[PDB]
C-alpha cells in the first residue's frame, strides 16, 4: 500500500492549480440534504485512519515508485516529487494533517458536518484534498450502518406492535452478503457496519476487522447458526430431499438449524416433508434449538404468507399477549431472498395484516444489505470550504446554478447540539462565539497519529434506537 | 489473511451435511440466462494468486479459526480434523482443481465459465468451502461486461456520426475511486474497466494488473490534468476566470479538463470561455485541447446546452458524415450521472441534434464500478455432480417458483461449435468430443496456478467484432 498511489489521478496535478501563496486548504464531509434517510450513522473513519493514514506512510521507495508510474500514466512530469520529499524529510513520512470528527456511532441529521480535514503545515496545502479519495470511501460503512439501522427501526416497530417487546431484535436481520460484495475488504467493512445494529452475520470477515480496529468486551462481535445450502440438499438426489432434511436436523439436534426448503418445491417440503414425514423430528426439538425453515425463491411476501399458512395447518398455532399468531417454539422461518429495506417493510406489514407475529420470522440480506448501495443514497460529499491565501482566510464554496442541492458550506465549521436537541453546523467560523456549547467534532487524527479512538461497544451504544432506550 | 475465516459461516457446518461416503463434490460457475447476452470472463487469476495458491493452512490459522468459530457458533462445530488433514498430507496446499475458460473470453450467458472439485475424497467439503471467495469473481466479470457494452454503444454512435472509431479507447474514463466500497474494489473494478478502455483516474487498478497480469506497455492506463471544484472555488467566487486562466496556462501543452459548473456552467461557457479567455483556447494544440467539464443538471440537457453555447462562440465544421464538429482545440466531457442508460440517452440525443460523438468523452464513477450487483448477470455457483458410495450422480436445483434458478446437471465442458460459437455439454457428454476439445483449461491444481494470462492476452480476447 502506497498512499501516493491511493488518490484520483487528477489530484496529482492539483498542487499547480490552487491560488499561488495558499497556506491552508480546509475541507469537510457531509451527507447532503435533498425510503428517506433523514439521519445517518457515522462509522468507519477509525479503520481508514489506522489502516492507511497513521505513521510513516511515505518512504523514498514509495516516492520513486509513484514518480515512475505517473511519468508513464500522464506521459508527462506532473508528480509533486518535492512536496512528497518534504514530508519524508521534515515529518519522517508522517502526514501534516488534522482530522476533526463526530464520535463514531453518532446519529446525525442530513446536511451536517461529520468530519473536517486540514493541513498543519503551510507547504502541504495540497495534502488536504489529496486524501479526499480515501476519506470519501467512508460513505460505504456510513451507508451500510444507516440502511441497516433503518431496517432495524422497521423490525423494532413491528416486533413491538405484534409482541409487546424487542426480544430477539438484534438477530432478526442476518448478513448473507459475503459472496455478493465486490471484494474481501468490502466484505469486512460492510459486515462490521451491519454489526453496529445487529449481532447476526455469516460474513466472518467483519469479526476480524472489529477485533483489530475497534474492539469488544465480548469474545466475538457477531454470531451465527448451522445452516444448509442447496449443495447439501441436492447432493442427496431429487428423491432423497427427506433423507437430507432428516440427516441435517439429527446432526444439529441441540442447536438452532436453518434448512433451505425450496430446492425442488418449498410448499411440498413444508406440507409433506416437514409437515408429515419428519414432523416427529421437529415437535421434539427444544426452544433453544428450533428448526428455521428457509424459503429461497419466488415472490418474497407471497411465499412467506403461503409457508406460514401451511405450517399453521400442520403445527399448533398459539396466540401471544398482543393477540398475534405464534408458531410453536421449535419452529421458525427465515426469508433470505430478495430482502432489502423495501421488501422487508412489505413482508412485516403483510404478516401483521394476516395477524402473524414478527417473533415468527427472521430476515437474511446479501446484496441488498452490503452491495446495492451508492455514494448518492446519502449524498456523501467532500468539499473545500475554507482557504488561506496571502495570509487572508477566505470562505470557499460551490453553488451550481442547475443544482442547489450541490451547494456546499462556507468557511470554518463546527457541529452543535441545540438546547431543544436539534443539530446545527455553524458556518464561517461562527462557532467561535460559543453560543451552542461545545463543538461535537473531536481531533481523531493529527500529524500521523490517531489522537482519539472508540470501541465497538461505544459505537453500538451511540447508534442505539430511541425504541431500544424506550 | 486466513482462508479458514474467508467463507460464509454456514459453510463451516456443511461437512456434517453431505451424504455419508461422499468422495467428490463438483461445482461450476455460470452467468445464468434471465441486454447482457455475453459476458467477459475476467478476474479469477487475481483470486487464485492472492488467496488460494501455496500453503494457505497453518497450525495457527487452524487455531485462530477454532477459537473464533467456538465463540461464533457458541458450539464446537469447526472441522479441525479436516483442515489438519490438509496441513499434514499436503503442507496446507488445497487439494482442489479449477478448470476455466481463458480470461478475456466473451462467452454467451448460460455457459460453464469455470468448475471446482476436490482432488482428494477426504476434502469433498472443500469444493463449496471456497465458493464464497470464487463467487466474488462476479464483480470483475460484471464490471468488464458493462464496460464492454458501453464501448459497443460508443462504437456504434462514433461510427455513425464520424465514419471511424478514432480515440474510442479514451471515450469512457474511470472516475469511480471515491464511490467504491474499498481500496481492494477500486483496484479490482478499475482493472476490469481497463480490459476495454485506456483512461482511468483509479490509480489502484494499475498496480493490480502489474502484479497479477502484466503488460508489454509500462502502464495499462492513462490520464490528463484536470480541475476539481476546490481548485476553482479556492480562488474566490469573483475569481473563477482567474482560476480557469491559471489552470489552462499551467497545462498549455497537454489536454486539460476544467470543471465549469462551480457557479454557472452556461455563463462559464458563454462569457468566461467564449469571450474573456477565448484567446487562450483557439491557440491550443489538437493533441492538447481544452476539455470543458459540466458536472450538474440533467446530463443530456446540459451537454446539448453546453455544445449549443460553444457552437455560437467557436467555429463549427460539418464532418464527412454531415455531423457538427467543434474546433480541434475544444472538447467536452460529461462525468455526472453517467451509467450505461444515460450514456445511451446522451449519444442518441446528440446524434438527433446533429452533433458528432468526436466532440464528447464520458466520465463514469459509481455507475461504472459501484452500481452493480451479482444479479445483473445472474452469476451463480452450484453443485452439479457428486460421487457417493463410489457412484456418480447428476445433482441440480429446480425451484417450483423460479425456473431461472434451475442449474446444470453432471460433469460440464465448454466447446467451440463448427459455426465458431459456444456450447455447454452436460452429464459428462463432453467426453465424446463431438465438437472437439474442452475449452476449459486447468488454471489451478493442488495449491498451484497451472495456467496464466497477461493483460494484453485478455485485452485481445475481449476485443469488439467491429
Ligand atoms: O439461514 C442461514 N444461513 C443460510 C445462508 C447463509 C449465508 C448466505 N446465504 C444463505 N442462517 C441463519 C442465521 C441466523 C438466523 C437467525 N435466527 C433465527 O431466526 C432464530 C430463531 C430461533 C432461535 C435462534 C435464531 C437465530 O439465530 C437464521 C438463519
Ligand atoms: O475530467 C477528468 N477528470 C476529472 C475527474 C477525475 C476523477 C474523478 N472525478 C472527476 N479527466 C479527463 C480524463 C480523460 C478525458 C478524455 N480525453 C479527451 O476527451 C481528450 C481529447 C483529446 C486528447 C485527449 C483526450 C482525453 O484523454 C477527459 C477528462
From Swiss-Prot, chain A:
Its main location: nucleus. Beta-nicotinamide D-ribonucleotide binds at residues 202, 294-296, 336-337, 367, 375. GO terms for biological process: cell-cell signaling; circadian regulation of gene expression; inflammatory response; NAD biosynthetic process; positive regulation of canonical NF-kappaB signal transduction; positive regulation of cell population proliferation; positive regulation of ERK1 and ERK2 cascade; positive regulation of gene expression. It comes from the Eukaryota. The modification Phosphoserine is found at residue 455. It is found in: Nucleus; Cytoplasm; Secreted. The keyword Secreted applies. GO terms for cellular component: cell junction; cytosol; extracellular exosome; nuclear speck. Expressed in large amounts in bone marrow, liver tissue, and muscle. Also present in heart, placenta, lung, and kidney tissues. Catalyzes the condensation of nicotinamide with 5-phosphoribosyl-1-pyrophosphate to yield nicotinamide mononucleotide, an intermediate in the biosynthesis of NAD. It is the rate limiting component in the mammalian NAD biosynthesis pathway. The secreted form behaves both as a cytokine with immunomodulating properties and an adipokine with anti-diabetic properties, it has no enzymatic activity, partly because of lack of activation by ATP, which has a low level in extracellular space and plasma. Plays a role in the modulation of circadian clock function. Homodimer. This is Nicotinamide phosphoribosyltransferase. The gene is NAMPT.
